[PDB]
Amino acid sequence: GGAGHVPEYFVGIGTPISFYG
């Protein structure tokens, strides 16, 4: 996400570098 709690790391690359909620 951006400032969430759970990691939005679902992709392999380095796109998802935040957390969602």
UniProtKB/Swiss-Prot annotation:
UniProt-annotated location(s): Secreted
Q: What induces this protein's gene, according to its Swiss-Prot or TrEMBL record? A: At the onset of stationary growth phase.
Q: What's the reported outcome of changing residue 9 to A/C/D/E/F/G/H/I/K/L/M/N/P/Q/R/S/T/V/W/Y?
A: Loss of RNAP inhibition
What residues does the record give for site: Essential for permeation into bacteria and for RNAP inhibition?
A: 9
- Cross-link for Isoglutamyl glycine isopeptide (Gly-Glu), residue positions: 1-8
Outcome of residue 4 to S? No change of RNAP inhibition but loss of bacterial growth inhibition
Positions bearing the site annotation: Essential for permeation into bacteria: 4, 7, 10, 19-20
This chain's function reads:
Peptide antibiotic that functions through inhibition of the bacterial DNA-dependent RNA polymerase (RNAP). Inhibits transcription by binding deep within RNAP secondary channel, where it sterically blocks the folding of the trigger loop, which is essential for efficient catalysis. In addition, it also seems to restrict access of nucleotide substrates to the catalytic center, and shows a partially competitive mode of inhibition with them. Exhibits potent bacteriocidal activity against a range of Enterobacteriaceae, including several pathogenic E.coli, Salmonella and Shigella strains.
Protein name per its UniProtKB record: Microcin J25
Q: Which organism is it from?
A: Escherichia coli
Q: What is the lineage of its organism?
A: Bacteria, Pseudomonadati, Pseudomonadota, Gammaproteobacteria, Enterobacterales
Q: Which gene encodes it?
A: mcjA
Q: Which residues of the full protein are shown?
A: 38 to 58 of 58
